[PDB]
Amino acid sequence: TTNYWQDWTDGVGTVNASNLAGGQYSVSWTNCGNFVVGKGWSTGSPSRVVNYNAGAFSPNGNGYLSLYGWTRSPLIEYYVVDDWGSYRPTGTYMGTVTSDGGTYDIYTATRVNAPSIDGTQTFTQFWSVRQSKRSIGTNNTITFANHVNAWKSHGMNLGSSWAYQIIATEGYQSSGYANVTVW
Numbered sequence: 428t429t430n431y432w433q434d435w436t437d438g439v440g441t442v443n444a445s446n447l448a449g450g451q452y453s454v455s456w457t458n459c460g461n462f463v464v465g466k467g468w469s470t471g472s473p474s475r476v477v478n479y480n481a482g483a484f485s486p487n488g489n490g491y492l493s494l495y496g497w498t499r500s501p502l503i504e505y506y507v508v509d510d511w512g513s514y515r516p517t518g519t520y521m522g523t524v525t526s527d528g529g530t531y532d533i534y535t536a537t538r539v540n541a542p543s544i545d546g547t548q549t550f551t552q553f554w555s556v557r558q559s560k561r562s563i564g565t566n567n568t569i570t571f572a573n574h575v576n577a578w579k580s581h582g583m584n585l586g587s588s589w590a591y592q593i594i595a596t597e598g599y600q601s602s603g604y605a606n607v608t609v610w
């Protein structure tokens with residue numbers, strides 16, 4: 428079961444996040460800047476099988492619902508995006524991976540002197556982005572090892588030191604509401 432609760436915001440606008448029982452959380456936001464809220468594990472694993480059910484995911488504008496986490500050595504921010512609002516995230520196309528009933532586009536990107544778990548840093552993003560939005564309100568599995576191993580085939584090797592790993596609601600200059608249960 429989950430062991431970790433993340434409630435990060437850059438403090439712009441209003442983000443109200445609730446650490447509910449077990450693997451459940453909710454977040455309501457109005458005119459946010461950037462925030463990343465969710466539940467999962469304080470140390471990620473490349474072989475974790477993650478399940479969630481988004482009781483609600485209703486961004487008004489830009490928001491993502493993703494498996495989300497970080498490695499160090501080197502510093503990598505990674506995403507498996509199952510749902511989004513007005514904006515589908517993309518980067519430099521690498522290929523596709525088919526997992527858990529969906530097909531995902533694989534992307535890389537460089538973030539130059541940008542916010543990170545270690546402050547301002549230059550780092551890399553690894554993305555799997557579903558080609559269509561996954562159903563909301565259903566029990567959804569992300570078999571993360573499929574993504575890790577697809578990424579590996581494109582030279583997208585994760586770092587050797589694992590930080591947190593969560594099913595994250597992320598907003599950017601938007602408003603919305605989400606309620607998610609993770610296990």
Ligand SMILES: O[C@@H]1[C@@H](O)[C@H](O)OC[C@H]1O
Nearest residue numbers: 435463542543544545546
């Ligand atoms: O963990 C946080 C990360 O999610 C955010 O993107 O930038 C600041 C970090 O503290």
